[PDB]
């Protein structure tokens, strides 16, 4: 069995290996990368996502989200308070202001310590889930706006033709902006490219151990757990590495820098934070190996998780018994 300790693997494809996206994912899996729940891919030195980032300031963040925390430093939830629209140039200036900028620090480890000590005492503003792409249309390799769609994968594997679309999303972050513990919708893969700016630290639980994280979360967030049998789908709960280690939960951590791709694998729980002003692009994707994970994915039916149009068909075809209840939660 490859990668039996479920370590995060880092890949350096050549320019020739970077041509065929599906083939390279399957390669990484042949080496056990999925066992970690997360892999890093460093593009060949010949590759670029686009020519420059000098002209992005006029992108609009229609609904910036202020991430307000409640709880204790290592075990907290966050809610998202909507703020007035602002441009990426305005948001960058905000991120760099004395109120929001990254503090002085020695290295990534010191910064990580400061994040876990101090996160809850501040409310950083995140531009999330903005439909669009920063890949140049002429970038042929690993262009997250040109990937094979999940609907076409389901159709290729299972023969059923379904409605829905699959497009990328932009994320503009600042110091302390936080992504809560979650798996993807329908336990899909994700791919995330850090276009510019400061790093993103990730934490991940191996897929084979995901239920250990879920059981800890039910203990740590007992009211939420009573409210919903899949409350991590709400994407609001944070648990620190120290707490995870205290409770024996297997996990790994890695820091993504600008120019690097991360892939999350089906049912790989992940969480993390941004080091300072940055911009990432991410999208879900599928492979044949995902299908069985999609059929088994938990679902929120309490009404909190509310998701895209395109997830309807996935539930309807893969999970027909659950469909009726889940759809009620959507409506
Ligand atoms: O970058 C972020 O804020 C969150 N991204 C992801 O969870 C991802 O790519 O799967
Ligand atoms: Mg612009
Ligand atoms: Ni994710
Ligand atoms: Zn729910």
Coordinates of C-alpha atoms and ligand atoms in Angstrom, one line a residue:
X1 CA 0.0 0.0 0.0
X2 CA 1.5 3.3 -1.0
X3 CA 1.8 6.2 1.5
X4 CA 0.6 4.2 4.5
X5 CA 1.3 6.9 7.0
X6 CA -1.0 9.3 4.9
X7 CA 1.6 12.0 4.6
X8 CA 1.0 15.0 2.4
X9 CA 2.9 14.5 -0.8
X10 CA 4.4 17.2 -3.0
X11 CA 4.7 16.7 -6.8
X12 CA 6.9 18.4 -9.4
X13 CA 5.5 17.5 -12.8
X14 CA 7.5 18.2 -15.9
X15 CA 6.0 20.3 -18.7
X16 CA 5.1 17.1 -20.5
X17 CA 3.5 15.6 -17.5
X18 CA 1.5 18.8 -17.0
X19 CA -0.5 18.3 -20.3
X20 CA -2.9 15.7 -19.3
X21 CA -4.7 16.7 -16.0
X22 CA -6.7 13.4 -15.5
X23 CA -3.6 11.3 -16.1
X24 CA -1.5 13.2 -13.6
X25 CA -4.2 12.9 -10.8
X26 CA -4.3 9.2 -11.5
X27 CA -0.5 9.1 -11.2
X28 CA -0.5 10.9 -7.9
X29 CA -3.1 8.4 -6.6
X30 CA -0.9 5.5 -7.8
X31 CA 1.7 6.9 -5.4
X32 CA -0.8 7.1 -2.5
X33 CA -1.3 10.9 -2.5
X34 CA -5.0 10.6 -1.8
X35 CA -4.4 8.8 1.5
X36 CA -3.4 12.2 3.0
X37 CA -6.6 14.0 1.8
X38 CA -4.4 16.8 0.3
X39 CA -1.4 17.1 -2.1
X40 CA 0.7 20.0 -3.3
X41 CA 1.6 20.4 -7.0
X42 CA 4.4 22.7 -8.0
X43 CA 3.9 23.6 -11.7
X44 CA 6.9 23.3 -14.1
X45 CA 9.0 26.3 -14.3
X46 CA 7.9 26.9 -17.9
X47 CA 4.3 27.4 -16.9
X48 CA 2.3 30.5 -15.9
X49 CA -1.3 31.1 -15.1
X50 CA -1.4 34.5 -16.8
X51 CA 1.1 37.2 -17.8
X52 CA 0.6 39.6 -14.8
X53 CA -1.7 40.5 -11.9
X54 CA -1.3 44.2 -12.5
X55 CA -4.8 44.7 -13.7
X56 CA -7.1 43.0 -11.1
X57 CA -8.0 45.8 -8.9
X58 CA -11.3 46.5 -10.5
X59 CA -12.8 43.1 -9.8
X60 CA -15.8 43.5 -7.4
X61 CA -16.3 41.7 -4.2
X62 CA -20.0 42.2 -4.0
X63 CA -20.5 40.7 -0.5
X64 CA -17.3 40.7 1.6
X65 CA -17.8 38.6 4.7
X66 CA -16.6 39.6 8.2
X67 CA -15.7 36.4 10.0
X68 CA -16.8 36.8 13.6
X69 CA -15.7 34.0 16.1
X70 CA -17.3 32.6 19.2
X71 CA -15.8 30.1 21.6
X72 CA -12.3 29.5 22.9
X73 CA -9.0 29.9 21.1
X74 CA -8.7 26.3 20.0
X75 CA -12.5 25.4 19.6
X76 CA -14.6 28.1 18.0
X77 CA -17.3 28.8 15.4
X78 CA -17.4 31.7 13.0
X79 CA -20.3 33.4 11.4
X80 CA -20.2 35.5 8.4
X81 CA -21.5 39.0 8.6
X82 CA -22.2 40.6 5.2
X83 CA -20.4 43.9 4.5
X84 CA -20.8 46.5 1.8
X85 CA -19.3 45.8 -1.7
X86 CA -15.8 46.8 -2.4
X87 CA -13.3 46.4 -5.3
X88 CA -10.2 44.2 -5.0
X89 CA -8.1 47.4 -4.9
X90 CA -10.1 48.6 -1.9
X91 CA -9.9 45.2 -0.2
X92 CA -6.1 45.0 -0.7
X93 CA -5.8 48.4 0.9
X94 CA -8.0 47.2 3.8
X95 CA -6.0 44.0 4.2
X96 CA -2.7 46.1 4.4
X97 CA -4.2 48.6 7.0
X98 CA -2.8 48.6 10.5
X99 CA -6.1 47.1 11.8
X100 CA -5.9 44.0 9.5
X101 CA -2.3 43.5 8.4
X102 CA -0.1 40.5 9.2
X103 CA 1.9 41.2 12.4
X104 CA 5.6 41.0 12.6
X105 CA 6.7 37.4 12.8
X106 CA 9.8 35.2 12.6
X107 CA 8.7 32.5 10.2
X108 CA 5.5 30.5 9.3
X109 CA 5.6 28.6 12.6
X110 CA 5.6 31.7 14.6
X111 CA 2.7 33.1 12.5
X112 CA 0.8 29.8 13.0
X113 CA 1.2 30.1 16.8
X114 CA 0.0 33.7 16.6
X115 CA -3.1 32.7 14.5
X116 CA -4.2 30.0 17.0
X117 CA -3.5 32.2 20.0
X118 CA -5.2 35.3 18.7
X119 CA -7.7 34.5 15.9
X120 CA -10.8 34.7 18.0
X121 CA -10.1 38.3 19.1
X122 CA -10.3 39.7 15.6
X123 CA -12.9 39.6 12.8
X124 CA -11.0 39.5 9.4
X125 CA -12.9 40.2 6.1
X126 CA -12.9 37.5 3.4
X127 CA -14.0 37.9 -0.3
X128 CA -15.2 34.4 -0.9
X129 CA -16.9 32.3 -3.5
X130 CA -16.8 34.9 -6.3
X131 CA -17.6 33.2 -9.6
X132 CA -14.8 33.9 -12.1
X133 CA -11.3 33.0 -13.2
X134 CA -7.9 34.6 -13.4
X135 CA -6.4 32.0 -15.8
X136 CA -5.6 33.4 -19.2
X137 CA -7.7 31.7 -21.9
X138 CA -4.5 30.8 -23.7
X139 CA -3.1 28.8 -20.7
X140 CA -3.7 25.3 -21.8
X141 CA -2.4 23.3 -18.9
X142 CA -4.1 23.2 -15.5
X143 CA -6.5 26.0 -16.4
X144 CA -9.2 25.7 -13.7
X145 CA -11.8 27.3 -16.0
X146 CA -11.2 24.6 -18.7
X147 CA -11.4 21.4 -16.7
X148 CA -13.7 18.5 -17.7
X149 CA -17.0 19.0 -15.9
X150 CA -18.4 16.8 -13.1
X151 CA -21.6 16.4 -15.0
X152 CA -19.6 15.0 -18.0
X153 CA -17.7 12.7 -15.6
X154 CA -21.0 11.3 -14.2
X155 CA -22.3 10.9 -17.7
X156 CA -19.1 9.1 -18.8
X157 CA -19.1 6.7 -15.8
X158 CA -22.8 6.1 -15.2
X159 CA -24.4 7.0 -18.6
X160 CA -26.9 9.5 -17.2
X161 CA -27.1 12.9 -18.7
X162 CA -27.8 15.7 -16.2
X163 CA -28.3 19.5 -16.0
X164 CA -25.8 21.7 -14.2
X165 CA -22.6 23.5 -14.7
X166 CA -19.2 23.6 -12.9
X167 CA -17.3 26.9 -12.8
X168 CA -14.4 28.3 -10.7
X169 CA -14.5 30.6 -7.8
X170 CA -12.1 33.4 -6.6
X171 CA -11.1 34.0 -3.0
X172 CA -9.5 37.2 -1.8
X173 CA -8.1 36.8 1.7
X174 CA -6.3 38.7 4.4
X175 CA -4.5 37.8 7.6
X176 CA -6.6 35.5 9.8
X177 CA -9.2 34.8 7.2
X178 CA -10.3 31.3 7.9
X179 CA -11.7 28.2 6.2
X180 CA -13.6 26.0 8.6
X181 CA -13.3 22.2 8.8
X182 CA -15.2 20.6 5.8
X183 CA -15.2 18.2 3.0
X184 CA -16.3 19.3 -0.4
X185 CA -19.9 19.2 -1.6
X186 CA -20.8 15.6 -2.4
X187 CA -17.3 14.7 -1.1
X188 CA -15.8 15.9 -4.5
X189 CA -12.2 16.7 -5.1
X190 CA -11.1 20.3 -5.1
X191 CA -8.2 22.0 -6.7
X192 CA -7.0 25.4 -5.5
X193 CA -4.4 27.7 -7.1
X194 CA -2.8 30.5 -5.1
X195 CA -2.5 33.2 -7.8
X196 CA -0.8 35.8 -5.8
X197 CA 0.1 37.2 -2.4
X198 CA 0.7 35.7 1.0
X199 CA 0.5 32.0 1.9
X200 CA -2.3 29.8 3.0
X201 CA -1.8 27.2 5.7
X202 CA -3.8 24.0 5.4
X203 CA -4.7 21.2 7.9
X204 CA -6.2 17.9 6.6
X205 CA -7.4 14.6 8.1
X206 CA -6.8 11.5 6.0
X207 CA -10.1 10.3 4.4
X208 CA -9.8 6.9 6.1
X209 CA -9.9 8.7 9.4
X210 CA -12.6 11.2 8.7
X211 CA -15.1 9.7 11.0
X212 CA -12.7 10.4 13.9
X213 CA -12.9 14.1 13.2
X214 CA -16.7 13.9 13.0
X215 CA -16.9 12.2 16.4
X216 CA -14.7 14.8 18.0
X217 CA -16.7 17.6 16.4
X218 CA -19.9 16.2 17.8
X219 CA -18.3 16.2 21.2
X220 CA -17.0 19.7 20.9
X221 CA -20.0 21.3 19.3
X222 CA -22.8 19.4 21.0
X223 CA -25.7 21.8 20.3
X224 CA -24.8 22.0 16.6
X225 CA -24.6 18.2 16.5
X226 CA -28.1 17.9 17.9
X227 CA -29.4 20.4 15.3
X228 CA -28.0 18.6 12.3
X229 CA -26.5 15.1 11.7
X230 CA -24.0 16.7 9.2
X231 CA -23.3 20.1 10.7
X232 CA -19.8 20.3 9.3
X233 CA -21.5 20.9 6.0
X234 CA -22.3 24.3 7.5
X235 CA -18.6 25.2 7.3
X236 CA -18.4 27.1 10.6
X237 CA -16.4 25.0 13.0
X238 CA -12.8 25.3 13.9
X239 CA -10.6 23.0 15.9
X240 CA -6.9 23.8 16.4
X241 CA -4.0 21.4 15.9
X242 CA -3.3 21.4 19.6
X243 CA -6.8 20.2 20.3
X244 CA -6.7 17.7 17.5
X245 CA -3.4 16.3 19.0
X246 CA -4.9 16.2 22.5
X247 CA -7.7 14.0 21.2
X248 CA -5.6 11.7 19.1
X249 CA -7.0 12.8 15.7
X250 CA -4.7 12.0 12.8
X251 CA -3.9 15.1 10.7
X252 CA -1.2 16.8 8.7
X253 CA -0.4 20.4 7.9
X254 CA 1.3 22.3 5.0
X255 CA 1.7 25.8 3.8
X256 CA 0.8 26.7 0.2
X257 CA 2.6 29.6 -1.5
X258 CA 1.8 31.7 -4.5
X259 CA 2.2 29.8 -7.7
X260 CA 1.3 26.4 -6.2
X261 CA -1.7 24.1 -6.6
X262 CA -3.3 22.1 -3.8
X263 CA -5.6 19.2 -4.5
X264 CA -8.1 18.0 -1.9
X265 CA -9.3 14.4 -2.3
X266 CA -12.8 12.9 -1.7
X267 CA -13.7 12.9 2.0
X268 CA -10.5 14.7 3.0
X269 CA -11.5 17.1 5.8
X270 CA -9.6 20.3 5.6
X271 CA -9.3 23.7 7.3
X272 CA -6.9 26.6 7.3
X273 CA -6.0 30.3 7.2
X274 CA -4.5 33.0 5.1
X275 CA -1.2 34.7 6.1
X276 CA -2.0 38.1 4.6
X277 CA -3.5 39.6 1.4
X278 CA -3.9 36.9 -1.3
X279 CA -6.0 35.6 -4.1
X280 CA -6.8 32.0 -4.8
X281 CA -9.0 30.3 -7.4
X282 CA -10.6 26.9 -6.7
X283 CA -13.1 24.5 -8.3
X284 CA -14.5 21.1 -7.6
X285 CA -13.8 18.1 -9.9
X286 CA -14.5 14.4 -10.1
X287 CA -12.7 11.2 -11.3
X288 CA -14.0 7.7 -11.6
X289 CA -12.8 7.0 -8.0
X290 CA -15.0 9.8 -6.7
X291 CA -18.3 8.1 -7.6
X292 CA -18.4 5.8 -4.6
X293 CA -17.6 8.7 -2.3
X294 CA -20.4 10.7 -3.8
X295 CA -22.9 7.9 -3.2
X296 CA -21.9 7.8 0.5
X297 CA -21.6 11.5 1.2
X298 CA -23.4 12.9 4.2
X299 CA -25.9 15.5 3.7
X300 CA -27.2 18.5 5.7
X301 CA -31.0 18.6 5.4
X302 CA -31.6 21.2 8.3
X303 CA -31.4 24.0 5.8
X304 CA -28.2 25.6 6.8
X305 CA -25.8 24.3 4.2
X306 CA -27.7 25.7 1.1
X307 CA -25.6 25.1 -2.1
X308 CA -25.6 25.4 -5.8
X309 CA -28.1 24.3 -8.3
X310 CA -25.8 21.7 -9.7
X311 CA -25.7 19.6 -6.5
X312 CA -29.4 18.7 -7.0
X313 CA -28.7 16.3 -9.8
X314 CA -25.8 14.7 -7.9
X315 CA -28.1 13.9 -5.0
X316 CA -30.9 12.9 -7.2
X317 CA -28.9 10.3 -9.2
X318 CA -26.4 9.1 -6.6
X319 CA -28.5 9.3 -3.5
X320 CA -32.2 8.9 -4.5
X321 CA -33.3 7.7 -1.1
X322 CA -32.0 10.9 0.5
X323 CA -33.2 13.2 -2.3
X324 CA -36.6 14.2 -0.9
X325 CA -35.4 15.1 2.6
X326 CA -32.3 16.9 1.3
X327 CA -34.3 18.9 -1.2
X328 CA -36.7 20.0 1.5
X329 CA -33.6 21.5 3.2
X330 CA -32.8 23.4 0.0
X331 CA -36.5 24.8 -0.1
Ligands
LIG1 O1 -9.1 28.8 0.0 C1 -10.1 28.7 0.8 O2 -10.6 29.6 1.5 C2 -10.9 27.5 0.9 N1 -10.6 26.5 -0.2 C3 -11.0 25.3 -0.1 O3 -11.6 24.7 0.9 C4 -10.6 24.4 -1.3 O4 -10.0 24.8 -2.2 O5 -11.2 23.3 -1.2
LIG2 MG1 -9.7 44.8 -12.7
LIG3 NI1 -12.5 23.0 0.4
LIG4 ZN1 -27.5 21.2 8.7

